[PDB]
C-alpha cells in the first residue's frame, strides 16, 4: 500500500514531462510556422545567436566525415577572420557535436534501408518563386528541434519531483506543476528560441538540484550519489558557461545549511567530492578553457571543501552566532583570495561583463559595452508588468505564505544562539531550497531574463503550503487537509486557464522578405571568399546562410571580440571617413552590411542609440559631422561622390545597405 505510491509518483512525473514537451512543441509550431517554411527560410528564422550555434551543426552534418567536420570546427578560420580559433571550448558547442554524431549515422542507416523519414513537396508562397519544404524526423531542423525539446521537456518532471520531495505529498507536486503551467510564459522561452544554450543547460541544472535535494533529505552517500551528481553536473557545464555561476549559487545555499547543523558530515563530503570531480571532468573536456578558472565556481568549491574538512575540529563550539560568523568569514576570505589571487595575481583572462552590468546600474559608470548590454531590455531591471502577471496567478502570495510558515516553524523548533554538534536540525532540504530561492530572486530582480531561475523556484517553494509538518501537523486532522488543498487547486484553475488560452492563441510572423533578397544578392554577386562585416545580428545570419566568412559575430562574452566590435561599429561614429576606411582596410573586411534604421535619431531614449554612444565614448571628436548623415545622404542621392574611398554596392528599398571598401 506504500509501494503503489511510488509507482503513481513516477507515472505522474513522466506524464507531466510528456505534456510539457507537447506544449512547448505546439507553441513553437504555432509561433514560427516551421511546417510550411522554405528550407533556406528556417535558418533566416534563426536570428542573431541561434544562427551562430546552428551553423556549426549544419557544418558538421555536411562534412565528408564526422571526424573531418569536428577537426574543421575545432580550427575555425571564418568565425573571426584573421586568426584560427577553437570554437568547441569558446562557444560550448557540445550539444551540436552530440546531435551531429547521432544524426549522421541515423541518416546513413535510413538511406541504406530506404526508410521514408523525410517526405516533402513544393510550397507555393505566391508572387515569390515557389520553394520546397521538407518535414519529418529526418529533416535536420526537425532532428535538432526534437532533440532540444526532448531535452527541455523534463523540466516539468524535475519540478514535479522537487514538489513531491519538499512536501512529501503528491499534492505538493501537483501544486508545483500547476503553478509552472500557468507561469510557463515567464518561466522559459524555449518554444521561441530553441537553438540557444540555456535550452540545453537548464534541464540538467534542475535535475541536479532535484538530485541534491534528494541526497540531502535522505542523507545518502557513497560512490552512487557521487556518480549521480556528476552525471548531471558535467553536461550542465559542457553545454553553457553560465552554469559555472549557477552552481556557485548552490554552494552559497548549501553552505548556509551546513553551518546550521542541517546536513550530516558524510553527505556534505559526498556532495563536495561530486562537485570537485564534475569540475575536473568539465575542465579536462574543454581543452582547459582558462575562463573556467578565475570564476566564482572554483574558489567557492575549494573554500567549501576546506570548511567541510575542518568542521570536526570545531565540534566543541556551543555558541551558534560565533560559529556561523567564523564560517562565513573563512568562506568569503578563501573565495576572494582565490579569485583575486589569480585574475589580478597572474592576469589569466577573466571576464568583467558580469561585473560591469552591475556597477553601471548603481554608479554612473557608462562605458560602451555596458551601454550595449543595458539597452537591450533583457539585461535591465525586471519590469513591473512581469510581477503583475505573476501575482495574478497567485504564484507569489503562495510562495510568501509558504516561506513565512517555514520561517515560523524554524524559529519555533530551533535554538538559535546555542548549537549541539551531535544532533541534526531536520528538514535541511527545505532550507536549502529556500536559500536558493532568495539567491535566484535577488539575481532576477537586478537583471531580467534570469527569471528563468526565479520562477521554477517559486513553483517549487509553493509546494511547502501542502506539508503536514509545516502547517500544524496533526492538529487539523486528515479530512480538512485534503479539503483545504482541493480548494486551493480549484482557485488556481480559475486564474490559470486564461493564460494558457492566450499562449496558445498567439501567432507569429514569418515574412522577413528584405533579408531574403539581400542574401540572394550576396550569394549571386560576390565571390566565395569575400569577408563581411556589419551589425552583429545580420552578420550571424550572413554566416549561417551564404557561408561567407565574417569578422564579428553575436557571441560577445570573450575578449578579443570586444575590441573587434569597438572597431567595426566605428562606422556610426563621428571620426573622419579616411580613418574609418583605413580601419576597415586594416581589418581586411570587404563589405559592410547594415540597416538604415540604425542611424536614425531616437530623442526618446538617448544613450541607447549608436549616434549617442559615440558621443561620450568619443568626446574629443564631438562636434564633427556624424557619419550616419553621410550614409543617409549617399543612399538617398544614389551618387556617392563625397564618400570617395567607400562605394555603396547594394541599396534596396532603403532598408539594407551593403558598402564596398575598395
Amino acid at each position: 500500500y506504500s509501494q503503489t505510491w511510488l509507482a503513481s509518483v513516477v507515472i505522474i512525473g513522466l506524464l507531466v514531462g510528456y505534456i510539457n514537451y507537447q506544449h512547448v512543441y505546439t507553441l513553437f509550431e504555432n509561433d514560427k510556422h516551421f511546417s510550411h517554411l522554405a528550407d533556406f527560410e528556417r535558418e533566416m528564422a534563426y536570428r542573431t545567436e541561434m544562427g551562430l550555434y546552428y551553423s556549426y551543426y549544419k557544418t558538421i552534418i555536411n562534412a565528408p566525415s564526422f571526424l573531418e567536420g569536428v577537426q574543421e570546427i575545432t580550427h575555425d578560420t571564418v568565425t573571426e577572420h584573421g586568426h584560427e580559433i577553437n570554437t568547441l571550448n569558446r562557444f560550448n558547442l557540445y550539444p551540436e557535436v552530440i546531435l551531429a554524431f547521432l544524426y549522421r549515422p541515423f541518416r546513413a542507416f535510413a538511406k541504406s534501408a530506404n526508410w521514408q523519414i523525410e517526405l516533402c513537396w513544393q510550397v507555393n508562397r505566391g508572387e515569390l518563386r515557389p520553394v520546397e519544404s521538407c518535414e519529418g524526423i529526418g529533416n535536420p531542423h526537425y532532428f535538432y528541434i526534437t532533440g532540444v525539446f526532448i531535452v527541455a521537456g523534463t523540466v516539468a518532471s524535475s519540478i514535479f519531483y522537487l514538489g513531491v520531495l519538499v512536501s512529501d505529498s503528491i499534492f505538493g507536486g501537483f501544486l508545483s506543476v500547476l503553478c509552472f503551467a500557468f507561469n510557463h510564459g515567464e518561466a522559459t522561452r524555449v518554444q521561441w528560441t530553441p537553438p540557444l544554450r540555456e535550452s540545453f543547460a537548464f534541464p540538467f541544472i534542475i535535475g541536479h538540484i532535484a538530485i541534491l535535494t534528494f541526497v540531502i533529505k535522505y542523507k545518502k552517500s557513497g560512490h552512487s550519489m557521487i556518480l549521480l551528481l556528476t552525471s548531471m553536473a558535467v553536461p550542465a557545464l559542457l553545454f553553457w558557461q553560465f552554469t559555472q555561476f549557477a552552481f556557485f549559487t548552490q554552494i552559497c545555499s548549501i553552505f548556509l545549511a551546513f553551518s546550521l547543523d542541517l546536513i550530516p558530515f558524510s553527505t556534505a563530503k559526498t556532495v563536495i567530492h561530486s562537485h570537485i570531480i564534475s569540475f575536473l571532468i568539465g575542465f579536462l573536456l574543454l581543452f582547459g578553457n582558462e575562463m573556467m578558472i578565475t570564476a566564482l565556481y572554483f574558489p567557492s568549491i575549494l573554500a567549501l571543501g576546506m570548511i567541510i574538512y575542518i568542521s570536526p575540529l570545531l565540534s566543541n563550539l556551543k555558541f551558534r552566532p560565533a560559529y556561523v560568523l567564523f564560517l562565513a568569514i573563512i568562506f568569503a576570505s578563501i573565495t576572494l583570495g582565490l579569485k583575486i589571487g589569480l585574475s589580478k595575481g597572474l592576469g589569466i583572462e577573466d571576464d568583467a561583463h558580469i561585473f560591469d552590468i552591475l556597477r553601471s546600474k548603481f554608479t554612473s559608470f557608462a562605458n560602451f559595452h555596458t551601454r550595449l548590454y543595458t539597452c537591450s531590455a533583457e539585461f535591465d531591471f525586471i519590469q513591473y508588468s512581469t510581477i503583475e502577471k505573476l501575482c495574478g496567478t497567485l504564484l507569489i502570495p503562495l510562495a510568501l505564505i509558504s516561506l513565512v510558515t517555514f520561517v515560523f516553524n524554524f524559529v519555533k523548533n530551533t535554538n538559535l544562539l546555542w548549537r549541539n554538534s551531535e544532533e541534526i536540525g531536520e528538514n535541511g532540504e527545505i532550507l536549502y531550497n529556500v536559500v536558493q530561492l532568495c539567491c535566484s530572486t535577488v539575481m532576477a530582480f537586478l537583471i531580467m531574463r534570469l527569471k528563468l531561475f526565479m520562477t521554477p523556484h517559486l513553483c517549487i517553494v509553493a509546494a511547502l503550503f501542502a506539508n503536514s509538518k509545516l502547517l500544524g501537523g496533526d492538529r487539523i486532522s486528515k479530512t480538512i487537509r485534503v479539503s483545504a488543498l482541493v480548494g486551493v487547486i480549484a482557485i488556481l484553475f480559475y486564474r490559470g486557464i486564461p493564460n494558457i488560452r492566450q499562449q496558445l492563441n498567439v501567432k507569429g510572423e514569418y515574412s522577413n522578405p528584405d533579408q531574403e533578397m539581400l542574401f540572394d544578392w550576396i550569394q549571386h554577386n560576390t565571390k566565395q571568399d569575400a569577408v563581411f562585416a556589419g551589425t552583429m545580428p545580420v552578420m550571424a545570419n550572413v554566416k549561417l546562410t551564404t557561408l561567407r566568412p565574417i569578422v564579428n559575430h553575436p557571441h560577445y562574452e570573450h575578449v578579443g571580440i570586444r575590441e573587434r566590435t569597438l572597431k567595426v561599429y566605428s562606422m556610426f561614429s563621428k571620426k573622419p571617413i579616411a580613418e574609418v576606411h583605413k580601419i576597415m582596410k586594416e581589418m581586411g573586411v570587404n563589405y559592410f552590411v547594415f540597416q538604415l534604421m540604425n542611424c536614425s535619431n531616437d530623442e526618446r531614449r538617448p544613450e541607447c542609440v549608436y549616434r549617442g554612444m559615440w558621443d561620450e565614448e568619443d568626446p574629443k571628436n564631438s562636434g564633427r559631422t556624424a557619419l550616419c548623415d553621410l550614409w543617409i545622404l549617399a543612399a538617398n542621392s544614389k551618387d556617392n561622390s563625397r564618400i570617395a574611398p567607400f562605394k555603396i554596392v547594394y541599396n534596396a528599398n532603403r532598408n539594407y545597405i551593403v558598402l564596398k571598401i575598395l
Partner: antibody
Amino acid sequence: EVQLVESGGGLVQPGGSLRLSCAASGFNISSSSIHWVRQAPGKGLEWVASISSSYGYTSYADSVKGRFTISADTSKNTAYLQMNSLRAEDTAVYYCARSSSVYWSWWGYSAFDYWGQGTLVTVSS
Amino acid sequence: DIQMTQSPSSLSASVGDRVTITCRASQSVSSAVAWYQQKPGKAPKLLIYSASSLYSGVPSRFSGSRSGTDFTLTISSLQPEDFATYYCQQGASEPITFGQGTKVEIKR
C-alpha cells in the same frame, strides 16, 4: 577584593512586587555576565535569570519567562531583579553568581566562580 | 531543557574513604560541566570547572573525570571538613540546569 552582595529580600503578599539588587565590588560589571539563581527550602539550586550587560543581553528561565525583569545599571556597577505576580512557590533564597560574558561565551558559559551571600524572599498571606 | 542527573542521591562514607559521585547528561554537553560544593547555611563554591580542571585554591585531593556523556567526581580520602552536598552543573546551553545533589554523611 571581588565580591557580590545581594540585598532587598524579605516578605511580600502573593501577587506583589519585589525589587532586589546585586552589587559587585571590585571587578566592573559589563565585563562579565551575572546570573540570579534560586534555591527553595530543602531543594536543589535552580537557575532563574541571566544578564550580560556589556551590550545588553538578557535571558530568563522558562518557568519565570514573563514575570521577572533583570536590568543592569553600569553607571554604579550594580544589577537589579524585579519580580512581579509572585506565586506561592517562588519563596526561596536567591544568589548572584558571576561568569563570562555571553558574547565571549565561546564554548559555553564559564563556571560561577564568585557567589553572593544570598537573600531570602518569602510570599505569605 | 537539558537534564543533569546525579546517580547516588545519598551516599555515606567514613573518614579517609575514597568516594565517587556520578553525573549523566541526557544531551551531549561536551566539557561544559562543573562541580560545586555546598555546606548548609552558606553559599556554594566552585570545586571543578570543565569536568577536568581543579579550581585555584581548593585542595588537590578532589578530581574530575569525563567519559562519554558520564562525568565523575573522585575524592581520594574524605575528611571531616568536606561533609556537605555536591552539585553537578552544565553550562553549554541557555537553560543552565543544576543536578539533584548528593549528600555525604558519616557512617556509624
